[PDB]
Curated annotation (Swiss-Prot), chains A, B:
Domain Peptidase C30: 1-306
Signal sequence range: none
Entry protein name: 3C-like proteinase nsp5
Boundaries of the shown chain within the full protein: 3264 to 3569 of 4405
Catalytic activities: TSAVLQ-|-SGFRK-NH2 and SGVTFQ-|-GKFKK the two peptides corresponding to the two self-cleavage sites of the SARS 3C-like proteinase are the two most reactive peptide substrates. The enzyme exhibits a strong preference for substrates containing Gln at P1 position and Leu at P2 position
Phenotypic consequence of residue 205 to V: In strain: Zeta/P.2
Protein's job: Cleaves the C-terminus of replicase polyprotein at 11 sites. Recognizes substrates containing the core sequence [ILMVF]-Q-|-[SGACN]. Cleaves and inactivates human TRMT1, preventing tRNA guanine(26)-dimethylation of tRNAs. May cleave human NLRP1 in lung epithelial cells, thereby activating the NLRP1 inflammasome pathway. May cleave human GSDMD, triggering alternative GSDME-mediated epithelial cell death upon activation of the NLRP1 inflammasome, which may enhance the release interleukins 1B, 6, 16 and 18. Also able to bind an ADP-ribose-1''-phosphate (ADRP).
Outcome of mutating residue 132 to H: In strain: Omicron/BA.1, Omicron/BA.2, Omicron/BA.2.12.1, Omicron/BA.2.75, Omicron/BA.4, Omicron/BA.5, Omicron/BQ.1.1, Omicron/XBB.1.5, Omicron/EG.5.1
Cytoplasmic side: 1-306
Catalytic site positions: 41 (for 3cl-pro activity), 145 (for 3cl-pro activity)
Stated regulation of activity: Inhibited by pyridone-containing alpha-ketoamides compounds 13a and 13b. In turn, alpha-ketoamide 13b (tert-butyl (1-((S)-1-(((S)-4-(benzylamino)-3,4-dioxo-1-((S)-2-oxopyrrolidin-3-yl)butan-2-yl)amino)-3-cyclopropyl-1-oxopropan-2-yl)-2-oxo-1,2-dihydropyridin-3-yl)carbamate) inhibits SARS-CoV-2 replication in human lung cells. Inhibited ex vivo by michael acceptor inhibitor N3. Inhibited ex vivo by compound 11a and 11b.
Cross-linked residues, Glycyl lysine isopeptide (Lys-Gly) (interchain with G-Cter in ubiquitin): 5, 90
Quaternary structure annotation from Swiss-Prot or TrEMBL: 3CL-PRO exists as monomer and homodimer. Only the homodimer shows catalytic activity. Interacts with host FBXO22; this interaction promotes the proteasomal degradation of nsp5.
Amino acid sequence: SGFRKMAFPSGKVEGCMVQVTCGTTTLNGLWLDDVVYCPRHVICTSEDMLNPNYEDLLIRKSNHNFLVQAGNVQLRVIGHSMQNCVLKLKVDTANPKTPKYKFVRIQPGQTFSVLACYNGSPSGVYQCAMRPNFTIKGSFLNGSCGSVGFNIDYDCVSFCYMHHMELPTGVHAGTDLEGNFYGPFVDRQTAQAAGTDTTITVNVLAWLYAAVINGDRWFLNRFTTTLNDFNLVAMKYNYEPLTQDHVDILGPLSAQTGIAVLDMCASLKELLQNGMNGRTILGSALLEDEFTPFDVVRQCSGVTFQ
Amino acid sequence: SGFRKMAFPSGKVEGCMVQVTCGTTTLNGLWLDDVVYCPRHVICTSEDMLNPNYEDLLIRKSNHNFLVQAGNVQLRVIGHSMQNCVLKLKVDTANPKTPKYKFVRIQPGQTFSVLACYNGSPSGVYQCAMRPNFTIKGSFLNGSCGSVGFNIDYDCVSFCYMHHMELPTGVHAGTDLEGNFYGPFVDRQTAQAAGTDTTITVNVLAWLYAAVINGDRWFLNRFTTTLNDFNLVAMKYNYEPLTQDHVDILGPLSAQTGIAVLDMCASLKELLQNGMNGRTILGSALLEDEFTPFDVVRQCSGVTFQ
Ligand SMILES: *C(=O)[C@H](C[C@@H]1CCCNC1=O)NC(=O)[C@H](CC(C)C)NC(=O)[C@@H](NC(=O)c1ccc([N+](=O)[O-])cc1)C(C)C
Ligand SMILES: *C(=O)[C@H](C[C@@H]1CCCNC1=O)NC(=O)[C@H](CC(C)C)NC(=O)[C@@H](NC(=O)c1ccc([N+](=O)[O-])cc1)C(C)C
């Protein structure tokens, strides 16, 4: 028993990280087959990051302006192209450690692991959610750009996030691996504020189920609620509306615990209106919203990958 | 910016995990060079876990009673010995993926990453703290024994924990890699008194320093405190008493931020006595105690957000 914020094992992605340097700018790239993917702003200069003309700047870049270092091996760039906000550097050698992989674009409310890297060297792994306002609350310093987010399904790595920038509120924004930003952001050092963030209601409910599974049951009551009456209360506390699709996705956790979804909603309604009365749930005084229902089932059943 | 509970990248440890089966009991083993390390209770059957004579069970076993599997490859056991609570199975093949490594025994309050494994395959990775009473608050199901905890310094893995059991309170206990239990515990299914679990004060202080480094000072104040006046408040709130040894460990964070250790203690004392009043620190409403001073320096910017 026990419930932890758990990241995917990172070994398959560790073997894909490289250092990419252009001019005096260094960041990380992702080496899959004979292509290295990295944020296109590696080609900018300090003097240019206000509103870079990326297409123009790339014209004046040759293959040998890109230094790609994979551990002890320098990779030769034999071709370069730009796809939206990512650069694709074709290289001499196919990565022998390339896993089975897909590029996916995730929905807000979904979770993924981030492999934080610096100078092509992985330094940490942690679990994140795509916020409703398309930001992530990551932990990224200078040099972290090109770090990637991913999920693992059996033996296949689904890459969903590449890191590009930090917002003034200290949260983070990036692209999918096709270079398309999540949310209304652009890769320029301009004035950019994210929409108001909301709590991911279906994830909070999933985590209350995790708590019950792990013996923490004090918040269960004998009240009932309809979906509409729950959503009338939840919206006033800045929670996302709960849809019928969300209720369906909570079906398996409901069957396992014997607690109806709308009964769990009633317990959450009491927590919102009355507070915790000084208590915690799974050690938290705030309600956790970065576990999906799939995250809870997977962890509580010991699903394995590699 | 940002601050996340970050685990070490798990790839170096994933390459070491194997499955060990004896009779009908399967758990995880750690394959380093030509030795597989695993918990000695792999040789137990369900009916004799109340008072197993481990040197009763082991003399009855031959090398070929141990089935060791790495991937789809059987490893042939050519020798075995018991050291404290761990079994050492000599195998006929050195692990080609053995990293540089050490075995270290850590102190209460210190942290490590756990690669939770089932049947020799990894399920996930997360960061843990050794509690003051030598337990850990993990996520371990049936079959997780032999999962290990570790730190990585450059490319040397320091293994410090191997998982053995869950206590009746839902917390977890295990050994160092020489098989010595952390805490006054033994590998049998009998009631064993545990010390009381207090909050790791030096780690809370380190995390307040992290909040300052990242740009937040709202919780500071002008008082100072003596060590003893602080510890009187600490014990009211179930915090571990702070020693001069602990104060010395916070030296680097104190110097980096310009806040004397006993001034941060005065700040913590006021947070405990007055609560948070709806505010948060690094996103938390409860003070975090699973970051050591070293963890903070490893994750935070070397440049304080002044
Ligand atoms: C890549 O490595 C680097 C990572 C950043 C660096 C700062 C610390 N944490 C990180 O995650 N990314 C960049 O340097 C990126 C380059 C651009 C996209 C070309 N720049 C930023 O992240 C900057 N953020 C902004 O410039 C920004 C400023 C103001 C506003 N605003 O609403 O006013 C929005 C965005 C960093 C401040 C350098
Ligand atoms: C190994 O895989 C397995 C892991 C356990 C399994 C249950 C779920 N979570 C885990 O971490 N370890 C065991 O099965 C272990 C083998 C013994 C130690 C020979 N048994 C247990 O973990 C049981 N624990 C106890 O019975 C127990 C009772 C009291 C104390 N104590 O110190 O007071 C310690 C252990 C579980 C009930 C299965």
